[PDB]
Amino acid sequence: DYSNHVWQCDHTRVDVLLVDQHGEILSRPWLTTVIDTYSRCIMGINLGFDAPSSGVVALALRHAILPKRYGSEYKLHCEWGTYGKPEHFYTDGNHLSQIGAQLGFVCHLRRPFKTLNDQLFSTLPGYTGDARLTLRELEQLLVRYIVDRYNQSIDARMGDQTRFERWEAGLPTVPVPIPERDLDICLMKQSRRTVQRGGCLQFQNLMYRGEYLAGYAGETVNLRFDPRDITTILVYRQENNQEVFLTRAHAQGLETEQLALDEAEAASRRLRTAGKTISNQSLLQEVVDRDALVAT
Amino acid sequence: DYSNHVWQCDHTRVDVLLVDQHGEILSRPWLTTVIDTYSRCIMGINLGFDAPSSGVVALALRHAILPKRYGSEYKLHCEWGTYGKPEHFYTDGNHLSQIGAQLGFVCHLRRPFKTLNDQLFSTLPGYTGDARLTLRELEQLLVRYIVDRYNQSIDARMGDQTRFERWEAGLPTVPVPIPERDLDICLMKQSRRTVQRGGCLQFQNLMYRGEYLAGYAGETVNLRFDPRDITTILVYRQENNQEVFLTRAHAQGLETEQLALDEAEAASRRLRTAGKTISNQSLLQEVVDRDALVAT
Amino acid sequence: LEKNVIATQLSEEAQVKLEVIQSLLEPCDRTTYGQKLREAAEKLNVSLRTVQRLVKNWEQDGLVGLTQTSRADKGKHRIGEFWENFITKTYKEGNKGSKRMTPKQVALRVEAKARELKDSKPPNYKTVLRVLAPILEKQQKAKSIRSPGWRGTTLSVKTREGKDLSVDYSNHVWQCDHTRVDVLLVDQHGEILSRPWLTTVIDTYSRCIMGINLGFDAPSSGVVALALRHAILPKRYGSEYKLHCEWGTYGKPEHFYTDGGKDFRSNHLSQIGAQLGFVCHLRDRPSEGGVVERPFKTLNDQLFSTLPGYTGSNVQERPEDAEKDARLTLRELEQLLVRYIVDRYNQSIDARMGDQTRFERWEAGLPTVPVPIPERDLDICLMKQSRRTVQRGGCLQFQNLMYRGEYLAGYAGETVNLRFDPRDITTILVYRQENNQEVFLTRAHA
Amino acid sequence: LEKNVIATQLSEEAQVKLEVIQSLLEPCDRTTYGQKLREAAEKLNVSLRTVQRLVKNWEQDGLVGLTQTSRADKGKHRIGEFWENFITKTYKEGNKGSKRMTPKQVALRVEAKARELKDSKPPNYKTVLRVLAPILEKQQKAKSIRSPGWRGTTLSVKTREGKDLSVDYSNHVWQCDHTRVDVLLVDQHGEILSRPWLTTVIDTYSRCIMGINLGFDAPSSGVVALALRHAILPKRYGSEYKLHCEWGTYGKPEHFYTDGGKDFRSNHLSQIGAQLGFVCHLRDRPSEGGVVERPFKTLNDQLFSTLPGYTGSNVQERPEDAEKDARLTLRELEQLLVRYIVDRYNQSIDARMGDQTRFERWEAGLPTVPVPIPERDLDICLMKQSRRTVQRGGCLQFQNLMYRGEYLAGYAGETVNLRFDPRDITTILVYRQENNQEVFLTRAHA
DNA sequence: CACCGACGACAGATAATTTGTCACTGTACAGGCCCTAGGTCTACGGTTAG
DNA sequence: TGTACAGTGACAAATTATCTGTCGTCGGTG
DNA sequence: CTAACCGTAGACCTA
DNA sequence: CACCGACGACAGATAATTTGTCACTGTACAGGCCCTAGGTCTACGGTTAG
DNA sequence: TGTACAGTGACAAATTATCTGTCGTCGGTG
DNA sequence: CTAACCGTAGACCTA
Ligand SMILES: [Mg+2]
Ligand SMILES: [Mg+2]
């Protein structure tokens, strides 16, 4: 009956082929979206390679809830102005209701895709129905469509206002941003890491250095991060029945450009592939057998 | 409607004071009985110091089920001739139904004591309402009453036959004894022991030596025993989801007379105090403080 | 000698099945029984057939039939028989003798062979780790079995000869050995001397300490004789030792049960044994006499590890501060050791049994009141040389010296026995054979 | 810089409470709300008053308020403050310096004090074990922190002086050290010789092995010079070594970064350094250069532990068979070591990064093609004595010998420099100062 | 004024936490690291020249 | 059956911070 | 009597 | 002869088990046990007597 | 940011013994 | 010239 009264989530396999940084072929990605049913406006998205099973939506919701703040690189003209909790959130069928509950809204269990197909995806390189497209590029394209076209379009059910304008028009009150740390029930976790002397951690073959983490050299901690950007990781101390936030740590030795999780894995497996090629065609096997024969 | 159609169990605190082997005062014992409701005949008993909670009845049932075979020491004149499963077994409120189930009879949940009071207990030394009585002596007295008097008495509800004779009279068939090992779902257990070289185990400060246990020196086994007689212990190997009988082991270095569990604990607790007695007066303390002063 | 597998506690699915079964075991009108089957299938939500196998299954296996049957391929390997045996064989050879083989090196050898044989699919390293697992594992228990020891009040020990010797009473069998003390010492000036040897004599029957000595003299027959001398004569100490109890032990053993090192199979000790009247026996293996060795650990744990200059049991744990911190002298350490032994150690409760202190076990167990052996009858611990010849004029040949004294000249040309103190040979006691008896003649001077 | 405690996953009781709360947070008709409270109490079966605290509780603590609140006395001790501090203090003193204290001994000291103070209720031994627990525990992590090392492609090392030295290219910085080889050797007759010393020169930039030598000569400036000689000149081996690849490394370092032991701060090495033109630097601590030391472990793990006569790595693990099994000679072992280094070790992938082999890291990283140093220009490794005086007649004084040769007589009374081979002093090369330049004059004969 | 929700003063019951007790088991006692091979640096009885 | 002390699971008893009622009081609402 | 000078040997430090 | 329970021949689906892959972490490299002090047992150049 | 290889959790893929249906057949019963 | 005899020293084993 009003804007943010009811939110609805949706998911699909996206039939666009992605190709990696080294020209290697990757499998097809998943897309999950969150939409406000009052004006049909897109609140937030999640594009990646993981199935919308248990996870993904947790991060998509977080994306919807938190302010957007996109960079110059996405070449956006319009501001993606939403943030804030709904009264109800519908998802496609416990932890999902725990999120609702810790945040303040009711979770329920149980179609933008029609327009992405026609207006974006079927027109992109690698469309499965030769050409290359990385995940980062695809996500830039996707948000450009959503912030500057879809949400700016006037629907046939309204005619007067755009999907975002009606969203604005229907707000019964000024929403107030929630401090981000309040959202740390969504971020993905690694269960155990040890603090290295000086206050450092390893994650995905990168080294991280923490602020005041040094006093714990030798203890076990666990950590959370946003797969879209792993340059800063949240470190938690493990208390009985609680993860109590300890500090933040920054990646070191990497490139200036912000690094995503899929990109880190890719670099690491390329290095492994390379190692598996030198080998010991005869150099090592011969030596071992000869060593044994000479000993005998 | 027939003998062993329905069995009923009963329990009480017995208000007779027992005194230990060293003249030390013990707390009051529990008694649990199993009775055949067709002729009101006592099938088996369990006398000890543990409450009829979870345990005890398991052993009393086993006692009822297995042949009795009492020794010369109980000075019995009559044979305690019962053995065998009933159709139904009632106890006073899972594991109890698992026993039923593995053995073959139905377990149900929900008054001989009136006569023990008048005809045995109120007349014994230590009756709480100065004199000494050990647990072993009391149990001998109890079974003497049950085998040669209670079950041999003609009840007012019959007049023709004794409680045992009617039990006999009401059997629709010849019961057949069950190999004892089939009853190893009742015996008390210790969860872990290690086999010592040569094939030996410690239990209650006694050493036991097994038959063919030697091949397992160094492995973990668990064990079961009858609290009334701990001279031979049953050793089991731990398989996934099963205790698989391995062997039997006999006590060594002890007296010829069969040893009960309560008696073993008593001897051991008789040594601990004997150790706590001498201690060190000024002796040790003086030496330690002097050692420190001389060092400085 | 078989059977009896008794099931472990059943989980929830089985618990439900159990109840279903309890209802279906009992026969009744055939049609009603049929109804129960239908009901059984709905309670389980499976099929109208299934519950026939479930009951039948129960009929033979009771509670066990309700457990999950394992896949029964467990423990098997899917690789070729040739390779499994190849891996096992390689490893057994790899550790034969003084060398060592790692599972990773084995996996490489396997790969090398695979090449020779043109086998495109040898097992992976991870697999080798799994195949050798049970072999690496058994060993861990094999090296760590804890012996039961003895149960108490009865004991015997074996000799090299395989003879069983009983230990029946106090001063029946005594044992002796040597160790080092894990403490560095200094002299009266602060200069460091290497840690001392500790020699103990222990009463086997009671485990009470009979006598000790410690100092810088390497083990010898001489050291043993000095140790025995202390263990045999009545003890006494001065007030400076700040003792509460007297150390009351003395006597003479019947058997001397000890190690096979040269310090104990010497002619010197044999002479002692012959003169005092006791017999020596040798251990079969280090594990045979443990009562003699054992107490050395308790000294480290209760006394020496609390003193400055403490080293360690091994060089792996030797404190780095161990060389600089030492300040104790031999005299001071000995005083500490004596007070420790007297008012604490021999005052503890026997470990095997009862309420007897070590000192008391010993005293209650001694058949008779001992008679002190006069101190002057310990001259027998002096060494005897089996022969020197007396020279004309009455002088005798010894260790690059000549000795002379009363009588000797009239006995020139005779072969004689010489008893002397290895520490001071100023004079010698000369014996001659008279009817195969060793009889004293004279005391000769250098 | 605070807050954000986020609850752990909730158990079943809390899950039920959560649902109750979801129903009660939402306002509605007051009376209906009242009905919900009644319903809430029945779903929980507690009271009509409880659920007001439960919601309020949720209102402030969210999911955390649904967890079980801890007792909040956790970690506290019930004994007197005096005793808790007494125990902590005693223990800290008990392990100061070279000595060791056990928790057991501490508990006794406590008891002794309790007597002095007439305190009838000191803590029990079990309590002492618990009070000291956190102290014994922290130590276990403290001794075991794993350093991150370096992330790759960039590195530097410190000197004793605190100077940072970069490692920028192949043959920039070389390192050298000495160890023992854990293998006993025999001679051509089967007679055992003590295990040999191994000396290595390692290229810091690439971690490729530059040259080795092993044998029975104890570390010296002489050994170092011999090691350098091998590392500097072009290498070649015969067919008997059964090699597949050539060992291709040679050149000259700029820095010689090594230990501070006397073998490396000698006038002899300094002369070498001056003549060849490179500079020496000393490690600050054993943990500072790890790249030089490290490879010694991989030799034990991949090569030496597979050979007969292997003697473990300590004295705790020394195989008992180690003394009897040795059959290898020095010549044979050296051949094995060379083939190992050449066709396996220097062929492995750099551990820090990429797909470069050790050998390749080195070659890609060397700025220029090296020019071989003529073998005859290694005469500079011979020792130079700073002075002897030439005697009348032309003879010079040396090591208890006189030497003579062409020219010398005309230079008598001059002070001269002598270059000689410590292994063979049959002749000496004589130099004199000419304008502060060292200029060759003659070769003198014994 | 009457009914229901929120908060508190108060007492009473209750599991959580700590402390003390008892039986079963791992592991060192078993000759053993202060000694050794270099180098620098310097003192020096003896020898020789004035 | 090699040996004997330091350290460790399993459990009972004492103390206490915290949860639960019952009732009283204040505030909002009908 | 007096002053200058290479080979042994001792004190000390380190791996 | 018709209906229901028990057993089997057969095919198909399914979790259990094994094997292979990948990222994160513990621990030795840092001069170091073959040497030493007894005893037995015997060989022996030199010395001395015939 | 001391160092690099042997050993180890966490998870995906291939193979297979075993459980589940559907139906047919034999035996007991009405 | 030839035979007998105590003190050093060497081979070997063990804790
Ligand atoms: Mg070094
Ligand atoms: Mg010995």
Numbering used by the authors:
A (entry chain C), B (entry chain A): 196 to 288, 295 to 311, 322 to 340, 353 to 519
C (entry chain B), D (entry chain D): 29 to 474
Sentences from the paper on this structure:
pmcCRISPR-associated transposons (CASTs) have co-opted Cas genes for RNA-guided DNA integration and are promising candidates for novel genome-editing methods. By analogy to work from prototypic Tn7 (2), TnsB carries out transposon end recognition, pairing, and the chemical steps which result in integration of cognate element DNA. We determine the molecular mechanism of TnsB recruitment to the target site (via the AAA+ regulator TnsC) and the structural details of the TnsB transposase.
To understand how TnsB recognizes and pairs the transposon ends and subsequently juxtaposes them to target DNA, we reconstituted and imaged a TnsB strand-transfer complex (STC) using a symmetric DNA substrate containing the first 45 bp of the ShCAST transposon’s left end. Reconstitution with this substrate resulted in a homogeneous, stable assembly (as assessed by size-exclusion chromatography) with which we obtained a high-resolution cryo-electron microscopy (cryo-EM) reconstruction (3.7-Å global resolution). B-L2 helix IIIα (red asterisk) wraps around the back of domain IIα of B-L1 (light purple) to nestle between the B-L1 (light purple and tan) subunits, forming interactions with both. The linker connecting domains Iγ and IIα in the L1-bound TnsB subunit snakes underneath each 5′ end of the element in the nontransferred strand, forming stabilizing interactions with the first two nucleotide positions. We observe “melting” of the 5′ end of the nontransferred strand through a flipped-out base (T1). This specific conformation is stabilized by aromatic interactions with W178 and hydrogen bonding with S175 and R380.
